[PDB]
């Protein structure tokens, strides 16, 4: 979280992405080091993307909250008669290219928001995205005007 002189303990490069994850991207996006955290891989637009474009589904292993160790590579989704489950893509072999979409910092420059369809998370564009801009997800906000 810092451009400083302290040593970095772990780096993720393009060489470490699973081959089947790379083969799965649509034309509009590519994988490339994140500008938000250059020690990890992120997702970038290759061409103009319209507002309202949907990507997904996000996939991952179903686990109880008590078994998941981070809030970065996971979403929570309810399954009737099974309960609230975490969909965990911490291990990239269990997920797809949506795993690599980094999070906006306090929503800054967010251009993707989550929506649930058929008990899976998809990402939808909040605004148009220009070629060479990083895809960044954050939560839904309360958008209504108090005027």
UniProtKB/Swiss-Prot annotation:
Domain spans labelled SET: 27-140
Tissue specificity comment: Highly expressed in retinoblastoma cell lines and in brain tumors. Also expressed in a number of other cell lines and in brain, heart, skeletal muscle, liver and spleen. Isoform 1 is expressed in testis at much higher level than isoform 3.
Compartments, record wording: Nucleus
Mutagenesis or variant effect for residue 105 to Y: Reduced histone methyltransferase activity
Tree of life domain: Eukaryota
Subunit structure: Binds to the retinoblastoma protein (RB). Interacts with GATA3.
Function: S-adenosyl-L-methionine-dependent histone methyltransferase that specifically methylates 'Lys-9' of histone H3. May function as a DNA-binding transcription factor. Binds to the macrophage-specific TPA-responsive element (MTE) of the HMOX1 (heme oxygenase 1) gene and may act as a transcriptional activator of this gene.
Assigned protein family: Belongs to the class V-like SAM-binding methyltransferase superfamily.
Record-given protein name: PR domain zinc finger protein 2
Organism listed in the record: Homo sapiens
Parent-record interval covered: 2 to 148 of 1718
